[PDB]
Each structure stands twice: as C-alpha cells, then as structure tokens.
Write a protein that binds this ligand. Structure first.
Ligand SMILES: CC(C)(O)C(=O)OP(=O)(O)OC[C@H]1O[C@@H](n2cnc3c(N)ncnc32)[C@H](O)[C@@H]1O
Ligand SMILES: CC(C)(O)C(=O)OP(=O)(O)OC[C@H]1O[C@@H](n2cnc3c(N)ncnc32)[C@H](O)[C@@H]1O
Lengths: 475, 475
C-alpha cells in the first residue's frame, strides 16, 4: 500500500515532522486512490474485529446474537449488513453490568492512562496510554491540514474536565509541536480575562465551540477590544453545528478576520477530528477514512446511502485498542459526497457538515425542523441580536413555531416601530425558509444566556409552550 | 555521587519504574548524606548560573548590577550573599519590556510546549518540551513518596487553565503510570457531579486545594453520599495553607477516612511539589533539594536562617532550561528544621508547612496575625460551621479583630442561647490564641461562599470594617 506507519496496534514515530513545504502530514494515506485505501480499510476492519472478538465479551455477545463472526467480514458490504450497530444505550448497560468501563474496554486495567466521560446515565472513558498517542498523532495530522504549524500559538478554549473536545485539541497541539495554550472554559470571569490574553499573546489558532467564539467577540467588544486584533489565522470548532452553517460561519470569520474550520464526530470516537475540513477544502468536513471508518447509513437498515444522499454517521475505530468502537450509531444527520476535493485529499465529504441529532428534530404541521435551520435563517439577518430560543412541546402536535428572538442593540436604539419591523421580518423569513407559521416574541438585547460550551436553544417544556402561545395570542 | 540521572540539561528515562517494594523513586538522591548532596547542588548551581548568564539578558543585567559573575559562586554561602533575589515584580517588568515571556525565557521560541500563567499584571509561563518532562518526572517521584502507585485512580480536581497546580499534578500522575482522572474545577454544577464520580470510580488519591476538599464533603453530604465511601487512601494539596494546619488537616482526614499530604511552592517554581510531605514524614513538607534548591532566609539580608528559625523561602531551579528561576523570593513565611525524617529521606523539613504570604499579615494592637492562625483556632472548635471572614482595614490602626463566623447547623438548631454560647466561646478562643480582643458576629449556616480554589477570607475594605464595628457596637 505504501501507507505511512500502517500498523495494528498502531505505534507512531513521535519525532516525525512533515517537510515545511508539504500540504499533507501523510501524503500517501491522505491522497492515495480511494479504492486502494478501501482495500487496506477492509484489511484493518478484519484485524480490529478479530481483536474485539478476543478481548471484548461485549462484542463477542452482541455479534453472536446478530449471527456475526469476524471471518464473515469479506467486503465493506458484509460490514454494513452483517455487523450490528452499537448504540450509546448499549455502552451504558455494559458499564452498569461491568463497571467502570464496560466489557468493551479490551486493554488490561494497567494500560489505562486517562479517565474522561459524558455529562448532562453518564459513560466513563478509560483511554489507554497507546490510544492517547494514536489520538494525539491523528489530531496533529488533521490540524496540519488546517494550516496550523509547529511554533504556532494554539488557544484551546473548551472546558478541561470529562469533556474530550479540549483534551483532543490539546493532544494534537502538543504533537504538532505548537505552543499549546490550554486556557480552557467553564468558570465565571474567564472570558473577560481570555480576550486580554488573546490581545497580548496573538494566537494563530483557536479551538472551542462555534457558540463560544460568538460569545467571546461580544465580551471582546464589551472589554473595548477588537477581536480582529487577536492575530488569528483560523478558528477550528467541534461540539455542535455552526462551523458549516452559512450565516454562523460568515459571522465568526467576519468578527475575527480569520478562517473557520469544522471538525468533530463524537467523544466515544476520539480521535473525534476524524471528520474535519482542510485549509483548501474549507467548507464542511472530510471523512479521514484511514483514521476512523465513516459510513453514512439509512437509519432503517444501517446500510450506506449513495453519495449525494442524507443519512446517519456510523463510525469504526481503526487505530484503537482501549474501548474500540465498531459501528457506533451517532444518531446525527448529514449528507455525504465523493467528488474531487480542492486540497487534493481523496476522502468522502460532508459538504454541509452535520445538521444535528435526529432526536433534537421537532415537527410543526407535518414539517420536520432541525434547530440549526432556525439558527441558520436568523444568523443571515442583519437585525438579529445573536441569540434566540425555540419553545416547543412533544406532548401535543404543534400548529405554529414559537420563537423568542433577540434584536440587535442598534435595532432596539432605533425605537418601537424599528423593533416591530424586525419582529415581522424575522417571522416572515423563518416562514419562507421552513414553510410553517412562526410566532416571534422579541426579548431585550443580551438578555438570553450566552455559553462557552454547546448552545441548548430548544425549550421542550409543555407549560412554557402554553404560557408563551397564550401570551402571543393576547398581544 | 551515584545520583540517579544527575545531568544538566536533565533527560529522564520515560520507561523507568521503581521496584514495587521500594519506598523511594530515587533511593540515592533522596536518602544520600545531606553534605554529599550539597556538594552536587553547588556543582549544579554553577551550571545553572552559567546557563542563565549565556541565554538570559534579564539575569545578565541583574547580576552585573549587584556585582555578581557565575565564577564567584564557590560555595552555598556565596550564593546567599552575592546572588540578588528575584522578585515577582522583576518578572512582570521583564515581560512588559520583552513580551511575551520576558528576557529570562532562555530557550528559543521553537522549544515552547505549554503556555500558562497567573490571574487575580499577570505573568505568562512559557514552558519548554524538555522542562515539561522534567516537571512530570519530578512530580511522579514525589507522588510515589506519598504512597501513590501505578494503576491507582488519581482525581485531579483543580481548574485546568492558567493555573499550574492542576497541570503539575496531572503530569506527575501520567508519568507515575497511574489512572489520571482530570475532572478539574471552576464551573457551576461540577462539585455535585464530582461526588457521584468519586462514589462510582473510588479513587486512591485526590488533588486540589484544602478548601475544595472541605466544600466537596459538604456537597457529598447534601447529595446524601458519604465521603468516606469514596475509597480514598490519600488527598494531596497545594495552593494555600491548610494541609499542615492542625484543625484543618484533622477535619479533612476524618471526613474522608484518608491521609492528607501537604505540597506546593509557587507556579513560577514548577515542579512546585519540590516542597512536599511523604507517607511516613506525613506532617509538614520536605525540601527536595536536588529538584529545586530551597533556602529559608531572613527577609532583611536574604541569607539562610539557622534550623529551628522562621524565614522566607527563596527557590532555585536545578532542572529547568525554560524561564529558570534563580533565587526567586516567595514572600511567604515558614520554619525549617534538619532533624532525622521518619521516611529516611535526608532533606530539610518545613514541619508546620507554610504559614502564609507576609503581605497577607495584619496587625491588631502591636500583635502580628496571619489569617491561617484564625482559621487554625476556629477549626479546632466543635461548634464552628466550616466558614468565616476576617474584616480589616490597612488605612488605620486596628484596636480589635472583627470576625464573621458561621456556627454549625446543629448549634443553630439548638436555639438562640446555644448560638450566643458559641459566639462567646469563639471570641474567647481567638483571644486566648492571638492575645488580642476579638469581636465575633454570627452569620447563618452555609451563607458564606465556599470555593473550589483558594480561600480569600480577608475583607480589607475600610467602609466594610467601619460598618461592621459600628453594627457590633449597637448590638
Ligand atoms: C466531538 C466533540 C468531542 O467535540 C463532542 O462534542 O462530542 P460529544 O460526544 O460530547 O457529542 C457529540 C455530538 O455533538 C454533536 N457534534 C459534535 N461535533 C459536531 C459538529 N462538528 N457538527 C455538528 N454536530 C457536532 C453531534 O450531535 C455529536 O453526536
Ligand atoms: C503551588 C501552586 C501551583 O499550587 C500555587 O498555588 O502556586 P501560585 O503561584 O498560584 O501561588 C503560590 C502561593 O500560594 C501559596 N501556597 C501554595 N502552596 C502552599 C502550601 N502548600 N502551603 C501554604 N501556602 C501555599 C503561597 O503563598 C505561594 O506563594
């Protein structure tokens, strides 16, 4: 194959640094014919499944139940149809019956290097020493693709706790031999201090959520600092949609005078940057197939949908020995294509990134709406204040969409008629985009809580919905 | 000398693990005759000063001004008298004139691995890749001394941001081949989730501030969880006094049913665990002289005080190439001794740890009081609620000590007379301990804000002091 350090278990050279003139960290793996890479991926898939069969009773039980033996994996079509998908609920049950890391941990307790997890039943991540190096090496490779280089100051501004996002970006920065600046997030008073550090330090790259980048520009402005004077060449994000959302990407690129990159699958899927945009293929994300095998499937049969069609990402680790995920169902919605990429990398693409989680979708008069579609339409409006909330009910069918929208400070300062003009135009814009009646209630500028993490814009409470609709009928 | 990996610049074997039966990580360095170690320390001091003279114009300028050349360093007595102390204010001025890391950085920009700093003018830490390994190796060595072993689950519960404390404990846990659990701190809702993770995971070791350990036991109790059921063998702390404070150490050891260890110098002094207690020498801290040279000096002449006398710690890095500190003044107060240690390590000891920062001390009727003396006396009382505040003024001389003290919930539930009995007894106890009049105002239980970081118990406001004294005169 000629694939750079193509081994299982993987063992990367910690001293390797690509030539300064190279666009690719691994020229072969990243640009080889897709059909040649798919031959080696299937080869690796067989190794991984044999490994999981040996060390994970969780996979041994699940596969035996669905009538699968690793020897039946003879093609990528066999993987799709014979291998059952892993659900996040299966991981919880495995961890409850086999605490703390479940019966899919594989490595002995002795090899466990880091303990992380989920929050908001939580799952524990028991990552081995070798897997941490595989994650760091994979991330340095993908960050190089974004134009991030050794010696560049990289600000990692996501919470350093159970959350894998921050740790993953730090591990990549460390291996890329960049100046890792792990400021983190989460504590009150952090954002006001961060803008001062960004003004002083002038970083080349920034990592966090797309929501935090917006909140931080407002903080920079309140602190009488200009976010374009932070010397950023790029901002790279994961955690939620935004970085491949038309109006959101444009607002962040304009506020910082830098490029925006979309990345991120799942925390269970670390190296989560396995889906990521590159400096030239800057819109959407590429599926780095030789790091993690991505399949975009029809949720009805868990089989790959054709290119140009929407489906759910199903992921398989190719370079992990601790808690390896084999066909984990994301529960997210995307669209994938297989056209020539501007960077020259021969990978499938998610041109619009990831739309959101299927469970977050709601319905108004037979029309399926994703919260990111509302966020996208509102962010493309000049008078929009940067924040909103969607008030819904899943206990009864909704006839109209209730929105609490913030106007801009200049729209508010322009008076009562100017506010009413924006409220009417916002309602109409959402209606033209979604094809459903939209009731808009204007709230005071900067009243809606901002976040340094993931934006939770849907209020699914029944009482709140009734209270709002009744108040919107009285006005 | 026979000293294990005694080299400058240092380059530790990343694969070395002490025998399972060994008490010491480095038996020679840790237990060799003190006079033999002092010969090699002086040797290293000469190497470090020669290195700083070559690569740091900050040290070149400062030393030339005070009439010092590295060749004049011929004994430990020469170091004391000829080498001028570095003040934290000198670091700020060096960083302002030579941004971002000052003229004492030494390493080229290319070698910088991590960016951290101070908060509450801030100083930036530019730590090189090699120094990070030196810090991690030094910390794994000191943590081994506390009885922490490979495979042990180590909870790091301090904010992972600019603060070096969390990063230092994590780096040590990683190198000790322990199961690093970097939960961190700082965000609302973290403590409630942490107690659940500690109940589930059952860690062998916990790192944070002594204040956070107290706050967390109250959170565990509110969450109907018993902190003794967290399976902790030890808790090791840095950041402020507490772990060598009589009543505070006893309260934490009782609440968790585990041992408490004191460690920590300064963030500028990473590896900051250079002052740390050991499993057998569990009271106070030992000065790990071959990691960082500690001198306890008279603040009047910056020369070493005899053993058994109080003074200020002055520190010198022996294993750092990036931002190396040579005779940095801590501004703290301690007492050092040179008697045989129960663990067998031949190091000077701080038997009562560090009392506090000299600038934090206040005076009432010609009597010098440290906030930790009030905290120590109150924590030794059965009716004390776990929190208090000291209300002072530095604009005018104080005749009495104003205290806002919290009673226990059981003292409150016992009625008005029981509350008045505690208030009178608290006032008398502080008076007997300090030798000054103490006015006590009781506040409602759990009203005073708790912290996951450093407790700021002194309220130095003039208006607040006058308001309180006037109210305590009316009652
Ligand atoms: C990828 C990471 C570590 O940043 C993360 O947030 O992982 P986590 O397991 O906490 O949550 C994963 C979910 O966040 C969402 N998400 C993460 N990155 C993106 C993204 N780039 N675009 C659209 N949604 C994303 C998806 O719904 C995904 O299933
Ligand atoms: C040592 C570290 C990284 O945890 C820390 O807090 O360093 P930082 O530079 O932020 O602050 C250092 C100051 O905290 C106090 N401190 C740190 N550890 C202790 C301690 N163990 N005992 C009595 N005071 C301590 C001293 O006043 C010291 O000068």
């Amino acid at each position: 194959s000629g694939m750079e350090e193509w081994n299982f278990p993987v063992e990367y050279d910690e001293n390797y640094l690509p030539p300064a003139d190279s666009r690719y960290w691994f020229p072969r793996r990243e640009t080889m014919p897709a059909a040649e890479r798919d031959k080696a991926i299937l080869g690796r898939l067989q190794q991984v499944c044999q490994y999981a069969w040996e060390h994970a009773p969780f996979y041994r039980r699940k596969w035996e139940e669905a009538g699968f033996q690793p020897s039946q994996l003879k093609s990528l079509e066999d993987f799709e149809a014979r291998v059952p998908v892993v659900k996040k609920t299966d991981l919880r049950e495995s961890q409850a019956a086999h605490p703390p890391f479940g019966d899919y941990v594989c490595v002995p307790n002795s090899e466990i290097f880091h303990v992380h997890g989920t929050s908001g039943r939580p799952t524990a991540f028991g990552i081995g020493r070798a897997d941490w190096r595989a994650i760091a090496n994979a991330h340095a490779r993908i960050m190089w693709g974004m134009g991030i280089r050794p010696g560049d100051l990289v600000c990692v501004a996501a919470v350093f706790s159970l959350y894998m996002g921050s740790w993953g970006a730090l591990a990549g920065a460390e291996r890329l031999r960049a100046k890792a600046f792990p400021f983190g997030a989460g504590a009150p008073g952090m954002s006001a201090r961060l803008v001062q550090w960004l003004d002083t330090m002038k970083p080349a790259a920034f990592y966090g959520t797309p929501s935090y980048a917006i909140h931080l520009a407002e903080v920079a402005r309140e602190e009488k600092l200009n976010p374009r004077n932070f010397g950023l060449k790029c901002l790279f994000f994961s955690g939620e949609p935004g970085a491949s959302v038309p109006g959101v990407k444009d607002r962040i690129e304009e506020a910082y005078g830098a490029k925006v990159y979309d990345c991120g699958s799942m925390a269970e899927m670390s190296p989560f940057m396995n889906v990521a945009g590159t400096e030239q293929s800057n819109d959407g994300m590429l599926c780095w197939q030789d790091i993690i095998y991505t399949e975009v499937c029809d949720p009805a049969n868990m089989r790959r949908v054709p290119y140009g069609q929407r489906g759910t990402p199903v992921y398989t680790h190719l370079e992990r020995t601790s808690q390896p995920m084999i066909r984990l169902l994301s529960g997210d919605l995307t669209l994938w294509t297989n056209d020539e990429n501007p960077c020259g990398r021969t990978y499938p693409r998610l041109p619009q990134g990831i739309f959101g989680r299927i469970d977050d979708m709601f319905t108004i008069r037979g029309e399926n709406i994703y919260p990111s579609e509302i966020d996208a339409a509102l962010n493309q409006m000049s008078g929009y204040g940067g924040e909103h909330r969607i008030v819904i009910t899943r206990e009864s069918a909704m006839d109209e969409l209730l929105l609490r929208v913030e106007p801009s400070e200049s729209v508010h300062a322009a008076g009562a008629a100017a506010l009413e003009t924006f409220r009417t135009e916002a309602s109409h814009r959402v209606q033209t985009v979604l094809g459903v009646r939209a009731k808009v209630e204007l709230v005071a500028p900067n009243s809606i809580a901002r976040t340094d993490f993931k934006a939770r814009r849907v209020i699914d409470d029944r009482e709140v919905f009734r209270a709002l609709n009744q108040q919107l009928q009285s006005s």
